[PDB]
Amino acid sequence: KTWSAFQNGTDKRVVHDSGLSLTEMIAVDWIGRNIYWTDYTLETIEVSKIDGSHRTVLISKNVTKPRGLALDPRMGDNVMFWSDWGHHPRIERASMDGTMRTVIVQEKIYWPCGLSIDYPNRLIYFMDAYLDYIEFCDYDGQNRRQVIASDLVLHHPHALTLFEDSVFWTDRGTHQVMQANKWHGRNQSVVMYS
């Protein structure tokens, strides 16, 4: 199941039933009052009303194995991004209503495990657990750079988040949460231990 609560633990409620897969992502719209989530067993991307009252399946034709989902709901952008782990692992972008679809990164993805957006710069940040890297590109994939890449720092990443000039990620191989500088990684810190 999927649950919604307040930042103080009160008013626990159920949005909708959810898939049993350990690889799942949820996205929310602070404008459209809609919620989007990924399904790894049915191989689908689904949209609903933030209160869960209405449900629909939005993309099903090529999303072999979703491992990441990110949204930009601003009036002038209205874009949705997700990552797939099929035999042709790629990062795909589509209008928030699925009426437009494009492939943004497909040349070196092998085990995508993170997807996050940086709204001021209009950048995408994604993580790969096979080549062990954190890399960012633009909404079209025509600008691309690598923040952190080494078998020493990244062992088994699973989630990525961004705040100011810092990037935060989680690693299952070291049971840790890490903070770094999102442009060059020349600053590294441990946010939570064990």
Partner: protein, 130 residues
């Protein structure tokens, strides 16, 4: 809540250092004597105790979980391409990919071999990405 849970939540573990080690009810026990931990964790896939012995007792998973093009990870219950199994890098969370004796895999001329014993396509050798 955190000051006695078997998890060293800070650099020196000041929280856990003060706790007793007697294994109250439902607390599964570990040989290193580090901490006693709740039974529910026994087969969830996390090495909850220091000497890797909470899950060590657990049984194996249904083999039908992955396609023939894939290999399965016992601790995580996840599927990874067959080529990755014995490539020389631990891909599974608990290292289930490098198993027993691998008959070590080698690198062909269309690829390059580096310091860490990994094989990479020749075009990648010098393009700006490590």
């Amino acid at each position: 809540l955190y000051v006695c849970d078997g998890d060293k939540d800070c650099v020196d573990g000041s929280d856990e250092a003060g706790c007793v080690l007697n294994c109250t009810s439902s607390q599964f026990k570990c040989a290193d004597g580090s901490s006693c931990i709740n039974s529910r964790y026994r087969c969830d896939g996390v090495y909850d105790c220091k000497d890797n012995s909470d899950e060590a007792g657990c049984p194996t998973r249904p083999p039908g979980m992955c396609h023939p093009d894939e290999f399965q990870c016992q601790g995580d219950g996840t599927c990874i391409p067959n080529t990755w199994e014995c490539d020389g890098h631990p891909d599974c969370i608990q290292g289930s990919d490098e198993h027993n004796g691998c008959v070590p895999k080698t690198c062909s001329p269309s690829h390059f071999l580096c310091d860490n014993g990994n094989c990479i396509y020749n075009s990648w050798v010098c393009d700006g990405d490590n």
